């Protein structure tokens, strides 16, 4: 618990990467979070949006 | 059926060309939602209900 400064510097960088990866599961208002769904379900004219 | 009492048909365990449908001049309307009408030949479904 005395090395909490160094272990927190490791934790904050791990939480920043884990947050950056979990945001790939978000829809952002698209039909799917997974890009191969959109490109396998829709024409390019529709999929571009 | 009358539209107050619409039929539902389970479609399952079979293969379906949709181009025989979407190429036909018969259809006065042919909307699709969440999928392209053209793309249906490239996909599978758990069941379909007509």
From Swiss-Prot, chain A:
Residues 7-49 form a coiled coil. It comes from the Viruses. Subunit of the fusion protein that is processed upon entry into the host cell. Mediates fusion of the virion and cellular membranes by functioning as a class I viral fusion protein. Contains a viral fusion peptide that is unmasked after S2 cleavage. This cleavage can occur at the cell membrane by host TMPRSS2 or during endocytosis by host CSTL. In either case, this triggers an extensive and irreversible conformational change that leads to fusion of the viral envelope with the cellular cytoplasmic membrane, releasing viral genomic RNA into the host cell cytoplasm. This is Spike protein S2'. The chain holds residues 943 to 991 of 1273 of the full protein.
């Amino acid at each position: 618990s005395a090395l909490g400064k160094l272990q927190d510097v490791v934790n904050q960088n791990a939480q920043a990467l884990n947050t950056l990866v979990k945001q790939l599961s978000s829809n952002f208002g698209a039909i799917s979070s997974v890009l191969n769904d959109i490109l396998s379900r829709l024409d390019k004219v529709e999929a571009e949006v | 059926a009358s539209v107050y009492a619409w039929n539902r048909k389970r479609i399952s365990n079979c293969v379906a060309d949709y181009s025989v449908l979407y190429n036909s001049a018969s259809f006065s309307t042919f909307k699709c939602y969440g999928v392209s009408p053209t793309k249906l030949n490239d996909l599978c479904f758990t069941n379909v209900y007509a």
